[PDB]
Amino acid sequence: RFLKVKNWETDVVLTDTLHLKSTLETGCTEHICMGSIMLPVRTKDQLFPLAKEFLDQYYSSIKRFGSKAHMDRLEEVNKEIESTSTYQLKDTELIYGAKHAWRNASRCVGRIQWSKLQVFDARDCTTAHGMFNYICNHVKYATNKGNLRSAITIFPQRTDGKHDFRVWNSQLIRYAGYKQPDGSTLGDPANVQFTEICIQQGWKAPRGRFDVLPLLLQANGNDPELFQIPPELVLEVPIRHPKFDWFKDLGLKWYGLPAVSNMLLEIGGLEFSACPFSGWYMGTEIGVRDYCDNSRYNILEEVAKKMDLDMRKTSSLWKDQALVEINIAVLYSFQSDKVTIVDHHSATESFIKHMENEYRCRGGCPADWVWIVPPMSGSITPVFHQEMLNYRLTPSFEYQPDPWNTHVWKG
């Protein structure tokens, strides 16, 4: 049974057979769509069918389905599960798994790059200091003096859920936020809650506007420990504007490496609860969301003031106008410092080409239109007119509750 999607700007129609391989649920039903809902402990019982399914996929991809290496591996995993109640992925399987978790990430516009992922095996790690050293190396390799390279570091998988590895930071590099007694916020409001945990764990907060947060790392279920990334490893870009000389005086900067560290990697029923992964920014992530969201740095007002816009009535579109300039400045600053960045016209065009190629050679490409469409200038990007099917494929990256809500404290 086939399903069709139509690009209404080019009348290109593609056919999706891949959605039949979907297993997990979406949250939607025949009578309700939850497409805009942000967010819609495992035993031997349900694990071998998950392993068998992953291994079938793995050996199909290497054109060895039904081979002796395939049947032998199935057997070996089988006995290892009934005997040890889990199993270990080979290096080849881990790398395939991590690449396909990205390939399957329906909300990721950057997936044209999925096959060029540098996979760092940190499964021998045992301590938070060992985590800090693995993460320092990831940051150095991925940053590459501005010539950014996609990377993932994979720490030991969950066993009984009482010995999890977790990175408590939502991203490896993020700026601190401090709520002031007068109700205002110093720094990134998005990080106030995490900043307070850090201070409570003994972090000495400089209390500046762009302080890089410490790493808060949890190994084998132990209490998390604080470490400071060497500042020389944190590449930062001062934001200036190519026409507006006063823009630099706003004193803004941003870090070069987007490295998301709070998601869970699922491969063949195995759960990798600490698996930081990094790429490079789309400009709007910083310029639209990080600076102009009302609940973020919210520099929209000051930029509009310095531009001398009609800020009286919103129908003057001063907000829209300031937003475009801030994003021009983000792109200009990164390009001038030769730090890898992509604008949202380039990134959406590439994704369409990626999506079409995936329909040709894979039978589909799961895609979350709500998330793929950029947060500004939506309809003048080619994804806006593109119909998309959203379904859940594994290997996958999943959400997980923040660890401070679930952690049993040692003391």
Add this chain to the structure above:
Amino acid sequence: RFLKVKNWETDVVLTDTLHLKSTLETGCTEHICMGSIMLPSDVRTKDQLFPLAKEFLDQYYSSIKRFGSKAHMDRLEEVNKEIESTSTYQLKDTELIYGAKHAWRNASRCVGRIQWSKLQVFDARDCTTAHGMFNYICNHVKYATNKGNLRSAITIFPQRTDGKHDFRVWNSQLIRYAGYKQPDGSTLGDPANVQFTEICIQQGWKAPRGRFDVLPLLLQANGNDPELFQIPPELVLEVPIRHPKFDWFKDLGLKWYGLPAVSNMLLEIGGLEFSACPFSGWYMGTEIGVRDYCDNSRYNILEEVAKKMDLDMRKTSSLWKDQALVEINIAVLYSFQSDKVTIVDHHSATESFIKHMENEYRCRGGCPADWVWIVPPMSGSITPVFHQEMLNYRLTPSFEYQPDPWNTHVW
């Protein structure tokens, strides 16, 4: 099952019980979300019709606080007998108006639904001819325009009987500009209307072959061949488009019409099918500026606007498209507001819609909403609907898509 939606910019959480009344289907399943598909989806048998009417009359008599009353049961009985005999039934004028207002109230893709109860309903069910149709539509246009002080209106023509006697307005909107292809390359006028502009000429229209030629009306009564009619130019209020800073803007020779009057949908009340039901409101600025002027398959004038702004059109990363998009939308609002023609900007409409959502959750328990369509086609994340989770589901009475008549009509 008593679902919840969170606003992520305000943490406000609403609880949706209204969705449990949902009758029709969304097109999603547990395995696949189709929330970005443009269009999912002959007589009604004597059996299917009575439950549809009971459901509708039940909610009608609830709304007037007479559920389970004398008047209710009698009406239920009376309609039951009429269907039994005539194989259809007629709505009381009160039921007609309620049904029409609630079809708007239920239009999950409509951002302007805070105005839903202030709909002027014109009962044209006594109409028998295309000339009579034309008379009703001129009266609609003049009433709705109101010398620029636009007023919401729907005009409802006779309901479908056996699908052989359908009343249809062939235009997609009452007022739309013509589109003629060129012997050399692209298109003059409006490319969305190229096929229809042909079926007008190919039906007898004498095209002035300008860029802003108001299309003729093509009206089909009782299933007969449709007829061409010209709307009196003095009823078509138009706004010349200029910019409050750029005097070269007028040189572009741009104007748009004040009245958005959609005429190709089907209104369904209590099982009855009104195939001709043109309804009108007033524009949100982006529906002209972002879509009608800057979509690649539309007026696509982005090229010359950025050129006349002397912007760096060599790399996409200068965001010249974005800058031009903002300016074109500032001009549309400016021109409409200057000429005292009603228009709403995307910031005001979306703010209004959050307020409407809150009202609907309070006094009705929910509000079906389609985030893919409620979020404006520009500056999405700086409008409040972006961070608002929404639940999409289909309630009746409703407006529905219907096939284009020329694909159906035996000529």
